[model samples]
Target: NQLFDAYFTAPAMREIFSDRGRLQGMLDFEAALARAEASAGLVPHSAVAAIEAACQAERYDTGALANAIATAGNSAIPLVKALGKVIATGVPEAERYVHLGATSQDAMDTGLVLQLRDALDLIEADLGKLADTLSQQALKHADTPLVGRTWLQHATPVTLGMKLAGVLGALTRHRQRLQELRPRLLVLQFGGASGSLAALGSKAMPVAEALAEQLKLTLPEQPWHTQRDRLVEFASVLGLVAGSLGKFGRDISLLMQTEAGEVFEPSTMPHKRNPVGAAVLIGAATRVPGLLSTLFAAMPQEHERSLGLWHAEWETLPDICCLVSGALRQAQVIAEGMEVDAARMRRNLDLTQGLVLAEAVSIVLAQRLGRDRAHHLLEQCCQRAVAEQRHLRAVLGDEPQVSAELSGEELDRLLDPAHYLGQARVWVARAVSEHQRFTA
Candidate 1:
């Protein structure tokens, strides 16, 4: 059956956090933990064999585990109880040594890391595509002149690529952040009751390193039973990533306005073409902050093992991951999605009596007309641009004093976008070239 969840998250990420994957994550921990303990001489060989046989997710009844989790309180406790059932069939004595000294937090946290590393691959892959699309968009629009807005008012001429570069550089920075945090976020979590592997005291460090190798995870400095920085930091990074896409959505939405006419979604209702893609990216972004605040709020668990705090985070990080995935997907779609009408942008610049470029014209007039007079002269000329009484070009020439000091050649030059766009090409080139660092 189809569901609405398809629209908000990636299938790759959804599968990574699916019930099978979730159970498999903890099962992976128990299997790896057993081998490491056996290798470090804390447990005998038979227990490892017994634990290994029962690691498959399909072997257990899924509904029964969910029922048990209601009273067992955490996923791992019910899972450990289930682990004993599967093991006792072949090696009944082996059941006692199955988990050795590791706590439920050890299994659960490491399992979460297992799932996260896989989930992160989906996010990171989409970002690489998103950021690359941004650079190409910036590079392609190099000479395309458009109006730059200030206070949402037309202020001056701007190349489309310059604003496109703003998206490029910000997304690339998010890519850098994702790259820098990998080792810190992808490490193993191993500690027993009260944050010490007390029963396996003499063999703890050795087994921890062995488990890290077996799991293909980074060996962290110590167990972080109550410390939540890794998940919090990763969540914060994605929120910022979502923020960038949110603003890009806003950029596209603004350009799609009927008056702007520079970009648009497909049309509907004779006059409306929805900014449908922007809505998804923007809406997905808004959800991210509240979830991030939840993750931040969940930190500072009571004692070594929290009563409610740690449980609060179990679903929170996955929710944040799903949201960022959705946002990045839409941003990538919108990057290639819309139609751009360069002619409409050029026509838009000519609206309001060459009004968008008035300052440049006024600057030339300032020397002869005086600064105070130039302001009035520029405002007065705009009327004829608006005036049905005459065409704008002839009116500027026909006015008595207006024709005296300024040449028609000079007048025409000031009317053009080339006269006012400052440093836009250089900015676009710089941002476009900077993306290669990540491409390598």
Candidate 2:
């Protein structure tokens, strides 16, 4: 199970969720809280230096501290105790002010918010990269023709640019979502026991303001200990990212099929190059929805603080972040490394023997022969073309009904794949323009 870590998650993301990172997030909180309280005249200014230096997670005995969490029922409780013990050795007065006004969940949840801020920055950078690669491909291929498939069968003509632009549009919106959710998701979670900072009493507001400033997090209107929507919203957005990437992987793999022969993988089997990077993206998507549901299940927590449900979030959220980070990296690889064959794409369009253009041909015939008559005639012509194992253009050429209304020159224009991409260029430009608007 652990063997796939490198394949399923990114290196920096893995480090961010590591034991040391998790420990330091809370320690950083404790250290900053000491500084904030001292600046607010609540704690001695002399206590700040020793407390801050002592708060580096490197100074704590993680194994002994790990054992104490089982007794205390929360890591922050054991951590605060250990930190207090550590501070007492040097500047003993700093011991009392180490954790100051915060509750266990306040330190715990805010620490996670700190971690998520870094994770989101990583995801945003990758999303921007994917958008750039897609936008470049989209503009470059706006006129590159291919057959549009519906229900896994050839339907009509489309340009490669339109497809790339569509993904680019989705990715741009994901970037927007990341930008908007930060202020909400990155806010302070510092309500003391019973949803009030009762520990610091009259000094609570001042200390909270100082802590928010020190930690570079927003001061929330109220504590959200039981209202789990903010965390859930973040998980939901990551789920959205997973699903979008999964769809992209699906399309890339489909185009990589032996029959389609449009896009190839980096390297798969000796002769059969499987879309492995796309598979990695797809695998992450499959796993993330269920992880997201666990967060949703944890949402219906009891009044002030739930008994056990909050614990459900401790591991789930980090796992979701790890899974999606892996997927984003793989998607970047696939988007950039996609070996597209324009000639192969053109060949596949004609694989249907001109039958893919039947809609365009039908519409043209309808203008001359009326709607119902043209529909029935083309239906018969398509059947005759397929039954006789002949191309539709030849079948139409031989038909006495089709000959009376049109000539060879007109048929050539009607059946050309390049001539049939409806509004594709406009749509591609819109996707690029909208992405530029966001980036700017």
RMSD of each: 2.6, 1.7
Cα lDDT of model 2 by residue, 1-440, tens digit: 56999999999899899878888999889888888888778888788888888878788788998899878888899888888898899988778777877889988998899999889999999999989988988999998998998998888888988988988988999999988898899998889888888888888889888899999999999999999899999999999999999998889989888888897765544656778798888898899999999999998899999978998999999999999999999988877767879999988888999988998899899987879888999999999999988989999899887888999999888888988999999999999999999987
- Backbone clash pairs in model 1 (N, Cα, C under 3 Å; residues 3+ apart or in different chains), count: 0
Residue 182 of model 1: what lDDT? 95
Number of clashes in every candidate structure? 0, 0
Q: Where is model 2 more than 4 Å wrong at Cα?
A: 267-270, 369-373
What is the per-residue lDDT of model 1 for residues 258-348, given as tens digits with 9 covering 90 to 100?
8897976544367667887788788877898999999899888888899788888988888888877777777777786557799998888
Tell me the TM-score of each prediction against the true structure.
0.91, 0.96
- Name the candidate that leads on TM-score: 2
Model 1 residue runs over 4 Å out of place are 265-272, 365-405
**Overall lDDT per candidate, in order of appearance:** 0.83, 0.89
Candidate 1: RMSD to truth:
2.6
